């Protein structure tokens, strides 16, 4: 491997996935369970060859990274003010805004909307398991167009996954610390 040199490799981390360095001490990328069956419990389709656990884990990692990046942006925003131009959003930090907004019937709306988007893109994941050429985390979302020049696309890929790992860990710290750089415990 290129990290943890005293372990050769998991088994499936050949390098076909971006941002691959070989770091997987527990060998989690070799579970034979096709996690698409957590969505569609049965084979359903006779053409459902199956999805490798590594590809499902890559999709989950990309989704986690995007969620964590947006989450740290939002949590940092509400520490330095920046409230929505509307009533009922006064100042109630981030450690308490979640509960007060769950009370005020709009976190349920956010849950519904996020679930709608998640269901559509999980249908995309299921089609990938069925055998579509779509790669993990690829929703073909390039509106501004900074995704051409394949070298730039690969660099931005590795950038996104590394930034997502950093943002996951940073959000874990921020939520655990209740923020120290911009507020108090």
């Amino acid at each position: 491997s290129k990290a943890v040199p005293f372990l050769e490799a998991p088994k499936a981390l050949d390098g076909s996935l971006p941002a691959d360095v070989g770091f997987d001490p527990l060998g989690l990328s070799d579970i034979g369970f096709d996690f698409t069956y957590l969505m569609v419990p049965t084979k359903w389709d006779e053409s459902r060859t199956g999805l490798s656990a590594l590809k499902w884990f890559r999709e989950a990692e990309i989704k986690h990274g995007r969620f964590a990046m947006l989450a740290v942006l939002g949590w940092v925003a509400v520490d330095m003010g920046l409230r929505l131009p509307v009533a009922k959003y006064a100042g109630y930090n981030a450690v308490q805004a979640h509960d007060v907004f769950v009370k005020s019937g709009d976190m349920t709306v956010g849950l519904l909307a996020i679930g709608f988007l998640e269901v559509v893109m999980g249908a995309a994941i299921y089609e990938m398991s069925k055998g579509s050429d779509r790669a993990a985390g690829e929703f073909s979302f390039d509106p501004l167009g900074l995704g051409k020049d394949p070298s730039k696309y690969a660099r931005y890929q590795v950038s996104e996954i590394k930034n997502g790992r950093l943002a996951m860990l940073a959000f874990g710290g921020i939520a655990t610390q209740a923020v120290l750089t911009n507020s108090g415990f």
Binding site: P41, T42, W44, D45
Partner: protein, 75 residues
């Protein structure tokens, strides 16, 4: 309603009663329940036997639970 989503009817979902019965063999019972699905899907008399026996037993259970726990006002 939950119990009604058990047997495979028209989708790739649910159970086949033939596969359930045929898998319930044992050292003491030889082939086990193999062929029981064919018996109960080709003989009305076997279905009538099972249904009537369990139906009479259910009627007796109903009779017991009636006076035991009176379910109607002023009964």
């Amino acid at each position: 309603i939950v119990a009604g989503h058990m047997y495979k009817t028209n989708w790739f979902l649910g159970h086949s009663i033939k596969t359930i019965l045929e898998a319930h063999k044992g050292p003491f019972t030889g082939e086990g329940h193999k062929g029981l699905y064919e018996v109960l899907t080709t003989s009305w008399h076997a279905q009538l036997a099972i249904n009537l026996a369990l139906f009479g037993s259910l009627s007796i259970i109903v009779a017991h639970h009636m006076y035991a726990m009176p379910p109607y006002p002023y009964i």
